[PDB]
Design a protein around this ligand. Structure first.
Ligand code: NA
Ligand code: NA
Ligand code: NA
Lengths: 511, 505
């Protein structure tokens, strides 16, 4: 009798139960830092299991932090719109222009005609291309720009699968989403400028250790490319096994010819390229080049033109500058010339197709991280990590790597690395084991945020495309994170200590 | 030829021309004040001319200020989201819950049954209800909540007239109702500190800059705002009913063959709605809980160690998020929470949020660039003119420049300029700040002036010339009434003639 009533209203009952069961944490402990811990636990629990919509959960910090007195409501609101949101708006303008004029369909059909009919090679090509392109621009930018093309490819293959005559389509869409999202292994690990975490680490190391000049482009790549490539290959294998099937003999039929014929027929139906598509392609190229030319790290960029106000113009300035141009560039004339022209995209079309839910979710994650920093919660974890000097070096490395890769779960990678570096470096120098030996694994594992969205902006951008099953993302991310941690361990043990000389105390380290 | 190509591409050519022609100012002056002034001029020109979408123009500060070097892009992005947006989200949840479950039509039909079918009495009732709601709710939230109900009212009125007969008058009535809601929202907002974010910003600025002064509170603000608000509301109602429908003398005070038929058909519509059911009542309960907490918690008294941490936006979020988990319908056997995030997303004015954030960022860049100090220095020699002429000029300037920028942005821009000016002329700071704060809310000429105007104009019944014609008269009436109130009754209560002890010498 009552069992059915409990089963039907499981979400409401679970929400109430998890609010009340963690309630003793604030009242007990004299209300010191368990309030922010309780807020984080409740929000994370609601994020793991779909008790509430993800954006509704992201709005919870705006309730909990002000009432607990951790930080004022004005500051919590100010934390909801950040630089990433301007970047997202700028990129979404371009994405709307791409999809409205069927440029994505044309690119997808051309790519399918060229190579990649087999799903395994298609996924491998997506991962390799996204990983290579993310070497230079950013994780967020590349994950945002290459995702529409992959979605178009998958949609076109699904449409052509009819062959003049399902469960496979959605699982392939999830696999494509995850492989685009998880292609952070090359995008930032390999190059110092690839990710934010790697610029912050380099700046901190140079400031704290001016004598050591080993960290530069062409030396980060040497020790980081093998590990990142191994992670990429193993993650591709793991994703191809988890979703769909893996057969060794298949990678090592008339349906393929029928699909190729359908794809060719559709491509011919597209016809010659249009003016709007040409303009959109040119603006895409200009945006990508401007992102690449901000600060390559080996040659001066255009930021040297502004070499008086450093850090003022970020990637989002480029995104906005090239995206707002879509609202004023003429697309069609209303040759009657009745009233005026029309823009490439109108605000009506931009309001839709905009991931407002993703913006709210990332804002909520930012607010939660800021609330954790404001209270003595992150500092508490860092101070708990400090008294491990008596432990062996490898155990210290493993504990630090796991703690960093699990604390970047709910906080942005730059915030986690900026928090942990001042904590680890005195700990590294307390023992005589080569502070790089402990700094490298932590900064490598900080970017391994493959679990849940909002942890990494690429994850949220990919999550924006409707395949909102968090449990699948968690299942894939656990394996990818384990693979990444294992490969980082193997690299520290094998490849990195020859060139960085991580076994003995260096001269540049303080005595 | 050339002329036809210029005529078709008006907006593109105008945008390029305005960007290029004002470039001499930053190129020659080489000062941060000039660059901020250039950004202000470009944004204002695009807002009046509407060459670019209002949100697209609002995003221009985040592209211009970082490039000019005024402040980093991170600060500009941080300036786009404030407590007003949290309040807006919290109240849009409730508005979505009201509209989805057909509560707006029920309230509309009950109101029509109560106050008959005469358009002027309906307009009076709408203005009174909107003012009462905006006394506690923000003007944007008040408009978003109220406007669907009046849309239902007018749609039912034209339906009844068409069926009884079996139009231009109905279109005029819809225009008048939209304008009256848009104005009355702000008119009610002027009454209280929490009615508008403009009053909250002014109050916090006055408290921070003048800690010694403790005059401002709910009671004082109500005492010197209620008479002016009532007079302005009544005169604006008279102006609106004279403009569109035409004035009446005695037929207004005082059944017609069509009247009983319309009442009857409204009655059958009301029974066609059916008895009140679930997915309602709970909406009313949550709304009255929101209002009760709004005028009970903040009249606090429970969170004393943290004063000002929890505000009306916290209560709005607390009540609104309950619309995402309370079950509505059975069936996976998972229930329905009375709102799906898709429904909230297709109701939330994201463009309004971006526009207000852009205004906030532009104002913040205005203080950071130092342009506000330059404006205050240039306005300092106003001491020669009498105090009444000084306040008249200040109020006229504020109400003229509030038609382009949002009310909170305008007030937060002008407070750091006006407050030192009051101290310089050795005059009571309140004597200058209060009229300016009251006249800041008088933004009626354009949809960009305040978000309620944009919400009203979004329905497409109104057009810009009618809004301008009504807003000019309402603004004149408001300025005159505010000046009269300052001259007559506010001074005896506040002793504004003498220089206060809290103000620096
Ligand atoms: Na990257
Ligand atoms: Na993270
Ligand atoms: Na305004």
């Amino acid at each position: 009798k009552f069992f059915s009533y409990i089963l039907v209203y499981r979400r409401f009952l679970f929400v109430v139960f998890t609010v009340l069961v963690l309630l003793p944490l604030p009242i007990v402990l004299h209300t010191k830092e368990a309030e922010c811990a309780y807020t984080l636990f409740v929000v994370a629990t609601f994020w793991l299991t779909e008790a509430l919509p993800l954006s509704v959960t992201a709005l919870l910090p705006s309730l909990m932090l002000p009432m607990f007195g951790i930080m004022p409501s004005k500051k919590v609101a100010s934390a909801y719109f950040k630089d990433f949101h301007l970047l997202l708006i700028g990129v979404i303008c371009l994405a709307t222009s791409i999809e409205k004029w069927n440029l994505h369909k044309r690119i997808a059909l051309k790519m399918v005609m060229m190579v990649g009919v087999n799903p395994a090679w298609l996924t491998l090509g997506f991962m390799s291309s996204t990983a290579f392109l993310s070497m230079w621009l950013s994780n967020t930018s590349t994950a945002a720009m290459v995702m529409p093309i992959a979605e178009a490819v998958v949609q076109q293959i699904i449409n052509a699968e009819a062959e003049v005559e399902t469960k496979k389509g959605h699982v392939t869409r999830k696999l494509t989403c995850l492989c685009i999202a998880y292609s952070s292994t090359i995008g930032g690990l390999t190059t110092i400028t690839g990710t934010s975490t790697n610029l912050i680490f380099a700046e901190y190391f140079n400031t704290r250790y001016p004598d050591c000049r080993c960290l530069n482009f062409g030396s980060w790549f040497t020790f980081s490319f093998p590990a990142a490539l191994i992670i990429l290959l193993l993650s591709w294998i793991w994703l191809q096994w988890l979703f769909l099937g893996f057969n060794f003999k298949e990678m090592f039929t008339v349906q393929q010819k029928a699909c190729a014929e359908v794809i060719k027929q559709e491509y011919q139906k597209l016809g010659p390229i249009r003016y709007q598509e040409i303009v959109t392609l040119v603006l895409f190229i200009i945006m990508a080049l401007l992102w690449f030319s901000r600060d390559p790290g080996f040659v001066p960029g255009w930021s040297a033109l502004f070499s008086e106000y450093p850090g003022f113009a970020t990637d989002s300035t480029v995104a906005l500058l090239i995206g707002l141009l879509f609202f004023l560039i003429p697309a069609k004339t209303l040759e009657i010339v009745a009233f005026d022209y029309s823009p490439l995209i109108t605000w009506k079309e931009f309001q839709s197709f905009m991931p407002w839910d993703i913006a709210i979710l990332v804002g909520g994650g930012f607010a939660l991280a800021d609330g954790c920093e404001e209270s003595g919660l992150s500092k508490w974890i860092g101070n708990k990590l400090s008294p491990l000097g008596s432990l062996p070096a490898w155990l210290i490395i493993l504990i630090s790597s796991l703690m960093v890769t699990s604390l970047t779960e709910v906080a942005s990678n730059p915030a986690t690395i900026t928090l942990f570096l001042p904590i680890l470096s005195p700990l590294a120098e307390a023992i005589h084991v080569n502070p790089l030996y402990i700094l490298i694994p932590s900064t490598l594992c900080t970017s391994f945020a493959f679990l849940l969205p909002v942890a990494n902006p690429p994850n949220a951008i990919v999550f924006s495309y409707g395949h909102l099953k968090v449990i699948d993302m968690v299942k894939a991310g656990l394996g990818v994170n384990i693979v990444g941690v294992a490969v980082v361990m193997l690299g520290i043990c094998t490849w990195i200590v020859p060139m960085f000389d991580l076994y003995t105390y260096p001269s540049w380290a303080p005595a």
